[PDB]
Design a protein around this motif. Structure first.
Motif, PDB file in Angstrom:
ATOM      1  N   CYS A 238      36.849  38.041  48.002  1.00  0.00           N
ATOM      2  CA  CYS A 238      35.925  37.146  47.312  1.00  0.00           C
ATOM      3  C   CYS A 238      36.066  35.717  47.827  1.00  0.00           C
ATOM      4  O   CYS A 238      37.144  35.125  47.757  1.00  0.00           O
ATOM      5  CB  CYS A 238      36.169  37.187  45.802  1.00  0.00           C
TER       6      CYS A 238
ATOM      7  N   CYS B  14      37.357  33.221  45.067  1.00  0.00           N
ATOM      8  CA  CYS B  14      38.739  33.429  44.641  1.00  0.00           C
ATOM      9  C   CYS B  14      39.724  33.563  45.799  1.00  0.00           C
ATOM     10  O   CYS B  14      40.921  33.324  45.602  1.00  0.00           O
ATOM     11  CB  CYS B  14      38.847  34.677  43.771  1.00  0.00           C
TER      12      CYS B  14
ATOM     13  N   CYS C 172      31.881  39.658  40.896  1.00  0.00           N
ATOM     14  CA  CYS C 172      33.339  39.666  40.962  1.00  0.00           C
ATOM     15  C   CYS C 172      33.942  39.648  39.565  1.00  0.00           C
ATOM     16  O   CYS C 172      33.725  38.711  38.797  1.00  0.00           O
ATOM     17  CB  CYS C 172      33.846  38.477  41.769  1.00  0.00           C
TER      18      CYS C 172
ATOM     19  N   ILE D   5      36.459  38.844  38.164  1.00  0.00           N
ATOM     20  CA  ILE D   5      37.422  37.838  37.754  1.00  0.00           C
ATOM     21  C   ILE D   5      36.859  36.432  37.802  1.00  0.00           C
ATOM     22  O   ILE D   5      37.400  35.545  37.125  1.00  0.00           O
ATOM     23  CB  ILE D   5      38.710  37.938  38.598  1.00  0.00           C
ATOM     24  N   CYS D   6      35.772  36.197  38.536  1.00  0.00           N
ATOM     25  CA  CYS D   6      35.073  34.921  38.535  1.00  0.00           C
ATOM     26  C   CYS D   6      33.570  35.067  38.339  1.00  0.00           C
ATOM     27  O   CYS D   6      32.851  34.067  38.439  1.00  0.00           O
ATOM     28  CB  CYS D   6      35.341  34.152  39.840  1.00  0.00           C
TER      29      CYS D   6
HETATM   30 ZN   LIG Z   1      35.633  36.063  42.590  1.00  0.00          ZN
END
Ligand SMILES: [Zn+2]
Ligand SMILES: Cc1sc2c(c1C)C(c1ccc(Cl)cc1)=N[C@@H](CC(=O)NCCCCCCCCC(=O)N[C@@H](C)C(=O)N[C@H]1CC(=O)NC1=O)c1nnc(C)n1-2
Lengths: 126, 376, 816
Positions: B272, B275, B340, B342-343
């Protein structure tokens, strides 16, 4: 988290049938429902599964065409004006929450152009 | 089944009826030409690559509609030096398929164009209303004769042509090397040194890595020209933005061939971009569902060009909506958006099959400008 | 920068030879082509008698003799590698011998891809036209009447784009060709007919067949038999109308026949020559069938003997055969009716020296006097040798080696030579007694750093493997004193002799690459240090390297070695080891390394010149300048601190430059080209030195020598601007007076040529044309010098006199 959905079947609200509410149900709602960009605007934003915990701190009046559909079938509205303002509420929420040029904003804008074209021919009340 | 791979190359989501063009214009090498620049296009175009367009603005519509009269070539600056609308090189794109639409009072033009020639920017003037011109000099192409043409023995000319390549292979190439570079005892360098600068031997070594991704690859699906091979290999390598202008600055296919061989044994894990630490895919999962390679440029309903990379598997994502079959880039599949986990950045999509027995039953497609090709 | 190029030794390799009645109707001749030199002889009972020798402004590619009807003797047709054609006639008036030209012109298409099988040129047996195959898919025809004095030709299209060999045919009313071509189906033989009026191919007199897959040679049998003979790799076939005769000689399976000649005028016998130096005789058996008809009945081949590796052949008289060669010495042999004890029918009569191909050389002094001696590495395979050229007309000496010498260097302290050599062995078993084998002491490297983990283990049957060697050769007797055999699959690309650090010893240092048939790039290498003392050799230390050592230079007591792209710099310590000091990673492989002072020149095979510098206090390398231009480059050399010289593709020379007083830093990192020249040959090595007496030099600043593939040796020296202007004027003035053979323009010959561009020569002065200033007559000198100024003041010596200029040119000639 998602809030509880808007209420359905409120016996205290007055109602009647009019040609404009019938037109808003049989023609307009089905026409919008049948659109490539309709699909996101058909149920409450489910903020838990979509993981959007800030949505409902900003958006205190959720609304969608599914909800409007139930209102029409259940004869919830008193007049055409109420529904025109509810549709405009749907559009305004999209432009307020998202940012210019975002995909969802273009999708809402596409829907609103046809909505305006259609409302220009709302029939006179019988 | 098989999913005829000539389908994605035709771009049938744009439409079916389009006016087509045949006449060609190539400018001479190292001449100065003034060519209009199409604004808001932010991508590096290589010669031979396909770029689809969907235009809405009145300045972008009145330009493309006077290209059609004169020579149908505009200029695509790389714009990717860093940013700021200043570039040193770019590629000419020629228009071949053209469709003109109409909407709620608005003019829409649909265009398909192909990259033609590389050039270097000299002057960049913003003229009239919003259309930037460009003085430009056409960069030549260099065709290098074989290394042994200079020292070939005259009595050995007849034995140069070999019998046709067999449809095992380890013996033929050794026999190929021994006879072609026989006149290497007349020089100071051994036989295997001239094979490292041989156009055929460099195209064959790259092939032995492309067919490993997806294994229906055929020779006639891939150019036999050193030039077209090198340009087509450059357009499907999952490489950073920096390396693309590096390959476009080389005027010889042989150095482009040798450079591509080094960019291929380094990039393993794609992560990513925001990230920088979360893994999406690797190079084991790349495969080609199109005749143009594992990576091609597609266009949006709103005009947002994406260069998508197809993979068998992807991890660290979650799903947003429900499958949507309209305006799908790969006919027969429905896409649900991937982000994604996580973000929540926009990574790409997931394609599921429509007919319940298709070539694969699911695969993912990732945009180029959302992944960081890192080093594991 | 200005430079001066002149040749010391004329080219010695042979690329063509013909026989016929050229000088007069009666005497038999032998014509030889040595790149740009043409030699005419007269064959006699004793041997060859030279009569004439001429130089041509080009590389001769096609040379044939023919006689149109109405001419007393043969005429000569020549076509150079720049597609320049002519017709030449021998004329003898008094005692003067001059070659007259009667028709010339350039035959080149404006657009076209040159063919892959080279230039082919043939003449009709009735002398009606000339057929040339320059570009694929076309055929060029020249009418051969007296009017065509400009060589006007036309093109005829072909539907086959892979014509291998083409020949005119004997005994046909209309000109008929017969060629072998290849299509995806295979190799087939066809035939056509050329019409002068229609300018198009008609239908062939006989029908197409399916010839052997490896057919390459077409022979046109003379009148009594007719037809054509096709020679491939496994069989020899005869084609005529419906008749078809084929044989499969088992003795020609070993090598590949590549040249032929006709012995008898009626086609009864033919000579054949293969790669490895073998001679064959092909006989044709005739039959008479009671109907006044002569028909071939069978074919057979014989093994005459063994000669040099042959490029050309020619039968002269009474069994005397000239064997022209490129990789070795040319010969005159005699054919015996009865075989000798060894079974050979061949007995060598003479030998002609040939220094090509020079792959390496060194300049030394073996007498400690002034004049220096040049020692080269000549020949290939069984023709390999060492040549010790001494200024003395050069006085060459030959030391046969029966191997392929690669590198040479000299150790003054040990009075010996270092040679890198290679011998071909079949899987091992040697093929012949090599110089490495016939050595006093031997030493085989022991493999401890190489476990040979990476190997194909595909040792086939009868495959060829190369074995490399390091040979110690005395400088007096030239005998081989030692032989070191490198490990299996090990190459040897670089060699240096030097002392490092604070040792008083002098060493040999060698860099190797451990190649394998599978991996296209080496991943292992070795650096080994040898000390040859008291007749013994030893390995003091070795340092394994990850890659291939392409080059090595001694850098002020340190070892500067190139490893692929790295330019790693090493050190010699007290404990006798090599320790890393600096690195400089690159985008190119450094094949060529040249050092002067603290600067380092780095190049690759694609002409990517680089310039580095050493920073002592920081102990690191920094780039100064670079010039990148894709082309093929042979070698580079350092002229001054600022100039760099190299040889590029299409037999060209180029010199760069560095600007130290540049205004900005953009032009302080660029090299500006200042010299371009079409030398005409393939340079392979550069060296600083001279052969003349040392000193006691106004148009001379350094004396760099070079050696070529054709065995030519030349000299380039720097120059002053005034003299460069003077010599440019001399050349321009002389070209108008000198009448070249074939009426070729001198500017076209020296124009920097490639497949893309063609610019006139700049920055180089050709000494060969100036040296001719002395051969001409006095009125010619007066015409050349007339209206010229050359002095330092005093009215520029008034009108500059011829005597001043002839003295000047004599002084110029004194440098070689
Ligand atoms: Zn991400
Ligand atoms: C259940 C509900 S409720 C509801 C949503 C959902 C799913 C959505 C939602 C968002 C987008 C769309 Cl579109 C539909 C619904 N979002 C939440 C808020 C939220 O999470 N925002 C972050 C979004 C990040 C990823 C964006 C990716 C866009 C690029 C793309 O995917 N673009 C397409 C057009 C494309 O390029 N397609 C390709 C593929 C192909 O084959 N051809 C093509 O053209 C939301 N906010 N309001 C409402 C109502 N929602």
């Amino acid at each position: 988290m998602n809030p509880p959905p808007p209420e359905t079947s409120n016996p205290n609200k007055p109602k009647r049938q009019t040609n404009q509410l019938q037109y808003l149900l049989r023609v307009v709602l089905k026409t919008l429902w049948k659109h490539q960009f309709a699909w996101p605007f058909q149920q409450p934003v489910d903020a838990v599964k979509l993981n959007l915990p800030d949505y409902y701190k900003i958006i205190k009046t959720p609304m969608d065409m599914g909800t409007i559909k139930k209102r029409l079938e259940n004869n919830y509205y008193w007049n055409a004006q109420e529904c025109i303002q509810d549709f405009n509420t749907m559009f305004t929420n999209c432009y307020i929450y998202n940012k210019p040029g975002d995909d969802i904003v273009l999708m809402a804008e596409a829907l609103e152009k046809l909505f305006l074209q259609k409302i220009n021919e709302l029939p006179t009340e019988e | 089944i098989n999913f005829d791979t000539s389908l994605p190359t035709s771009h049938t989501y744009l439409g079916a009826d389009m006016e087509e063009f045949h006449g060609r214009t190539l400018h001479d090498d190292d001449s100065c030409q003034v060519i209009p620049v199409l604004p808001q296009v932010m991508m590096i175009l290589i010669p031979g690559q396909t770029l689809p367009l969907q235009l809405f603005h009145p300045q972008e519509v009145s330009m493309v509609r006077n290209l059609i009269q004169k020579d149908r070539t505009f200029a695509v600056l790389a714009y990717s030096n860093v940013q700021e609308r200043e570039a040193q090189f770019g590629t000419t794109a020629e228009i071949y398929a053209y469709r003109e639409e109409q909407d709620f009072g608005i003019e829409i033009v649909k265009v398909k164009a192909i990259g033609r020639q590389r050039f270097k920017v000299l002057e960049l003037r913003t003229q009239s209303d919003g259309i930037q011109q460009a003085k430009v000099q056409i960069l030549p192409e260099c065709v290098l004769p074989s290394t042994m043409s200079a020292v070939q023995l005259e009595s050995l000319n007849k034995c140069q042509i070999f019998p046709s390549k067999p449809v095992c292979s380890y013996k033929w190439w050794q026999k190929y090397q021994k006879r072609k570079f026989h006149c290497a005892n007349l020089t100071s360098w051994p036989r295997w040194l001239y094979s490292l600068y041989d156009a055929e031997t460099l195209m064959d070594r790259i092939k032995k890595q492309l067919r490993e991704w997806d294994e229906n690859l055929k020779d006639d699906s891939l150019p036999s020209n050193p030039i077209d091979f090198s340009y087509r290999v450059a357009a499907c390598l999952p490489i950073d933005d920096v390396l693309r202008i590096q390959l476009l600055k080389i005027g010889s296919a042989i150095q482009r061939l040798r450079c591509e061989l080094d960019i291929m044994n380094k990039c393993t894990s794609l992560c990513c971009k925001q990230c920088q630490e979360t893994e999406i895919t690797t190079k084991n999962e790349i495969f080609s569902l199109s005749l143009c390679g594992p990576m091609a440029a597609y266009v949006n309903p709103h005009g947002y060009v994406h260069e998508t990379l197809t993979v068998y598997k992807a991890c660290n994502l979650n799903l947003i909506g429900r499958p949507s079959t309209e305006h799908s880039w790969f006919p027969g599949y429905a896409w649900t958006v991937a982000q994604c986990k996580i973000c929540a950045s926009h990574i790409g999509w997931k394609f599921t099959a429509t007919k319940k027995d298709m070539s694969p039953q699911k695969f993912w497609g990732l945009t180029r400008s959302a992944l960081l090709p890192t080093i594991p | 920068s200005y430079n001066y190029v002149v040749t010391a030794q004329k080219p010695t390799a042979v690329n063509g030879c013909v026989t016929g009645h050229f000088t007069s109707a009666e005497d038999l001749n032998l014509l030889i082509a040595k790149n740009t030199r043409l030699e005419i002889y007269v064959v006699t009972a004793e041997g060859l008698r030279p009569v004439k020798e001429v130089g041509m402004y080009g590389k001769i590619a096609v040379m044939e003799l023919f006689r149109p009807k109405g001419e007393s003797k043969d005429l000569l047709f020549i076509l150079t590698a720049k597609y320049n054609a002519c017709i030449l006639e021998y004329k003898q008036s008094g005692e003067s011998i001059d070659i007259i030209t009667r028709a010339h012109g350039n035959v080149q298409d404006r657009i076209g891809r040159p063919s892959e099988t080279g230039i082919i040129g043939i003449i009709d047996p009735e002398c009606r036209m000339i057929g040339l195959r320059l570009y694929d898919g076309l055929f060029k025809v020249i009418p051969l009447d007296r009017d065509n004095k400009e060589l006007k030709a036309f093109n005829i299209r072909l539907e086959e784009l892979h014509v291998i060999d083409v020949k005119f045919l004997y005994g046909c009313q209309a000109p008929t060709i017969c060629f072998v071509y290849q299509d995806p189906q295979g190799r087939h033989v066809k035939t056509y007919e050329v019409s002068l009026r229609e300018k198009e191919f008609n239908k062939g007199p006989w029908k197409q067949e399916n010839v052997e897959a490896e057919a390459s040679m077409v022979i046109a049998v003379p009148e009594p038999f007719g037809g054509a003979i096709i020679i491939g790799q496994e069989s020899i076939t005869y084609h005529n109308g419906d008749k078809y005769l084929a044989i499969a000689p088992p003795i020609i399976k070993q090598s590949t026949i590549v040249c032929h000649n006709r012995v008898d005028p009626n086609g009864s016998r033919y000579l054949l020559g293969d790669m490895e130096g073998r001679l064959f005789m092909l006989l044709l058996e005739k039959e008479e069938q009671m109907d006044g008809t002569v028909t071939l009945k069978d074919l057979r081949v014989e093994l005459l003997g063994e000669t040099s590796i042959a490029e050309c052949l020619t039968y002269l008289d009474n069994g005397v055969v000239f064997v022209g060669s490129r990789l070795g010495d040319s010969q005159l042999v005699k054919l015996n009716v009865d075989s000798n004890e060894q079974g050979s029918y061949v007995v060598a009569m003479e030998t002609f020296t040939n220094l090509g191909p020079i792959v390496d050389m060194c300049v030394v002094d073996l007498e400690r006097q002034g004049q220096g001696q040049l020692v080269t590495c000549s020949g290939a395979f069984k023709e390999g040798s060492l040549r010790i050229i001494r200024n003395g007309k050069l006085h060459i000496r030959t030391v046969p080696l029966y191997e392929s010498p690669r590198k040479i260097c000299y150790q003054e302290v040990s009075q010996c030579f270092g040679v890198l050599s290679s011998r071909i062995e079949v899987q091992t078993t040697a093929l012949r007694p090599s110089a490495s084998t016939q050595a006093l002491s031997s030493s085989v490297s022991s493999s401890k750093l190489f476990s040979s983990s990476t190997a194909p283990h595909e040792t086939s049957f009868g495959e060829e493997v190369e074995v490399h060697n390091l040979l110690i050769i005395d400088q007096h007797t030239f005998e081989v004193l030692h032989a070191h055999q490198f490990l299996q699959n090990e190459y040897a690309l670089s060699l240096v002799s030097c002392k490092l650090g604070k040792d008083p010893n002098t060493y040999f240092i060698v860099g190797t690459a451990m190649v394998y048939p599978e991996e296209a790039e080496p991943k292992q290498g070795r650096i080994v240090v040898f000390q040859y003392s008291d007749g013994k050799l030893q390995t003091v230390a070795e340092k394994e390297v990850k890659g291939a050592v392409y080059s090595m230079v001694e850098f002020n007591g340190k070892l500067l070695a190139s490893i692929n792209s790295t330019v790693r710099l090493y050190e010699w310590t007290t404990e006798k080891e090599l320790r890393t000091e600096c690195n400089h990673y690159n985008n190119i492989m450094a094949l060529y390394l040249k050092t002067k002072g603290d600067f380092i020149l780095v190049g690759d095979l694609m002409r990517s010149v680089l310039l580095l510098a050493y920073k002592p206090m920081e102990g690191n390398f920094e780039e100064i300048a670079r010039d990148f231009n894709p082309n093929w480059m042979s070698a580079v050399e350092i002229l001054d601190d600022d100039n760099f010289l190299g040889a590029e593709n299409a037999f060209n020379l180029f010199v760069c430059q560095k600007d130290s007083a540049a205004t900005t830093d953009e032009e302080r990192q660029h090299l500006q080209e200042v010299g371009l020249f079409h030398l005409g040959e393939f340079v392979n090595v550069f060296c600083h030195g001279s052969l003349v007496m040392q000193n006691l030099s106004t148009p001379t600043q350094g004396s760099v020598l070079f050696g070529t593939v054709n065995g030519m040796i030349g000299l380039v020296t720097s120059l002053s601007e005034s003299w460069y202007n003077l010599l440019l004027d001399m050349q321009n003035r002389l070209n108008k007076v000198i009448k070249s053979v074939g009426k070729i323009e001198h500017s076209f010959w020296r124009s920097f040529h490639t497949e893309r561009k063609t610019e006139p020569a700049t920055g180089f002065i050709d000494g060969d044309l100036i040296e001719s200033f002395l051969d001409i007559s006095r009125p010619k000198m007066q015409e050349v010098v007339a209206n010229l100024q050359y002095d330092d003041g005093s009215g520029m010596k008034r009108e500059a006199t011829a005597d001043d200029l002839i003295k000047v040119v004599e002084e110029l000639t004194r440098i070689h």
